[PDB]
Amino acid sequence: LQLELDSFKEELDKYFKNHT
Amino acid sequence: LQLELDSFKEELDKYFKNHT
């Protein structure tokens, strides 16, 4: 569970990077 | 797990659209 949670957290930053 | 992860992804997608 922790690895996929970290992967989802990493994917979360993609939308923040694309918003700029 | 995958279905609820996709649901969380779809919910996350709404916050960036609401922020704009």
Side-chain angles (χ1 to χ4, degrees):
Chain A
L1 192 275
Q2 197 70 207
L3 274 74
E4 50 191 358
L5 183 60
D6 297 0
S7 180
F8 189 83
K9 177 59 181 60
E10 175 67 24
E11 184 182 1
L12 180 148
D13 198 12
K14 299 181 180 180
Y15 281 91
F16 279 107
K17 294 301 179 180
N18 184 85
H19 181 274
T20 60
Chain B
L1 194 277
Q2 196 70 206
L3 274 75
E4 55 191 352
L5 186 61
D6 296 0
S7 181
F8 205 3
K9 155 72 176 56
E10 189 69 21
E11 180 180 1
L12 170 148
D13 184 70
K14 301 179 181 180
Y15 301 105
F16 296 91
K17 301 301 180 180
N18 186 28
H19 180 268
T20 58

